[PDB]
Write an enzyme that holds these catalytic residues in place. Structure first.
Site, PDB file in Angstrom:
ATOM      1  N   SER A  58      23.594 -25.058 -10.755  1.00 25.92           N
ATOM      2  CA  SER A  58      23.606 -26.110 -11.246  1.00 25.92           C
ATOM      3  C   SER A  58      23.154 -27.020 -10.269  1.00 25.92           C
ATOM      4  CB  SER A  58      24.868 -26.383 -11.742  1.00 25.92           C
ATOM      5  OG  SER A  58      25.102 -27.440 -12.524  1.00 25.92           O
ATOM      6  N   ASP A 100      23.292 -23.365 -22.434  1.00 19.36           N
ATOM      7  CA  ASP A 100      23.658 -24.243 -21.613  1.00 19.36           C
ATOM      8  C   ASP A 100      23.744 -25.592 -22.263  1.00 19.36           C
ATOM      9  OD1 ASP A 100      24.150 -25.869 -19.195  1.00 19.36           O
ATOM     10  OD2 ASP A 100      22.810 -24.521 -18.074  1.00 19.36           O
ATOM     11  N   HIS A 140      26.460 -22.520 -19.229  1.00 18.30           N
ATOM     12  CA  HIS A 140      26.147 -23.071 -17.965  1.00 18.30           C
ATOM     13  C   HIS A 140      26.947 -22.316 -16.843  1.00 18.30           C
ATOM     14  CE1 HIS A 140      24.705 -26.182 -15.265  1.00 18.30           C
ATOM     15  NE2 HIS A 140      25.927 -26.331 -14.763  1.00 18.30           N
TER      16      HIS A 140
END
Ligand SMILES: [Ca+2]
EC number: 3.1.1.74
Length: 257
Positions: free
Chosen positions: A130, A175, A207
């Site tokens: 991320s 995601d 995600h």
């Protein structure tokens, strides 16, 4: 012969589970280091060999435990891996890049003697999740000495990274935090056309897919690190002529095949 080659000839199945090396850990306390928030080192044991090093960053609000499975997974296949905690859980992607740099300096210099004794400081790579994947892209741009970079479901507000470091990006089809159409795919497309690059998209994945045992992430991350950190061409087979039932997209400029 390749002096950096480690472990038996790989099978795809073997890359979906912990590898042939036993693993130990050392916990790096926050107060003991400068420039990052400490973390956990995973390293192979029971061996007199040296291995490449990998520094990994978690994402916004997260800590090193969110990538513990992957740090152990990589170490068990023959790597010294430092998964960092950040100075603040709210640090952004470029801050995470700076902390990855500080962690690589620590790993080479101030880590335990036993860790340095099995680390080849000439062969280093980065990965992250991320905003930590955003940090991976940024440090790759800042530091062309790195051998490889693996951004996992990455997030960054800047979309273009002028890096010569070979990059494999993992996107997640479902995601809703860093959607691939706005993040992972633009990152891949905007990398220099002369830099070896791969994009893989996990079907149906969210995600948080990188935060627990994931066979595809394991295969692609181990293989990219093996190919570029170790020059281990036995892992080309998993990155070329790809027909993976878990993937909903695969892109490459085929500079590694
Ligand atoms: Ca600190």
């Amino acid at each position: 012969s390749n002096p950096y080659q480690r472990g038996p000839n790989p099978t795809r199945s073997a890359l979906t589970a912990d590898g042939p090396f036993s693993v130990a850990t050392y916990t790096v306390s926050r107060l003991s280091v400068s420039g990052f928030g400490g973390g956990v080192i995973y390293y192979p044991t029971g061996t007199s060999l040296t291995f490449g090093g990998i520094a990994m960053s978690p994402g916004y609000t997260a800590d090193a435990s969110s990538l513990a499975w992957l740090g152990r997974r990589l170490a068990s296949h023959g790597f010294v891996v430092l998964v960092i905690n950040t100075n603040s859980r709210f640090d952004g992607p470029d801050s995470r890049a700076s902390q990855l740099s500080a962690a690589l300096n620590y790993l080479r210099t101030s880590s335990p003697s036993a860790v340095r004794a099995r680390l080849d400081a000439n062969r280093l790579a980065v990965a992250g999740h991320s905003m930590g994947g955003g940090g991976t892209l940024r440090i790759a741009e800042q530091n062309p000495s790195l051998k490889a970079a693996v951004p996992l479901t990455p997030w960054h507000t800047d979309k273009t990274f002028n890096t010569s470091v070979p990059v494999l990006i993992v996107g997640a089809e479902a995601d809703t935090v860093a959607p691939v159409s706005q993040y992972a795919i633009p990152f891949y497309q905007n990398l220099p056309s002369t830099t070896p690059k791969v994009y893989v998209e996990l079907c149906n994945a969210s995600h948080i897919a990188p935060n627990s045992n994931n066979a595809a992430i394991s295969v692609y991350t181990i293989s990219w690190m093996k190919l570029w950190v170790d020059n281990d061409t036995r892992y080309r087979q998993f990155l070329c002529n790809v027909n993976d039932p878990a993937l909903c997209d695969f892109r490459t400029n085929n500079r590694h095949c």
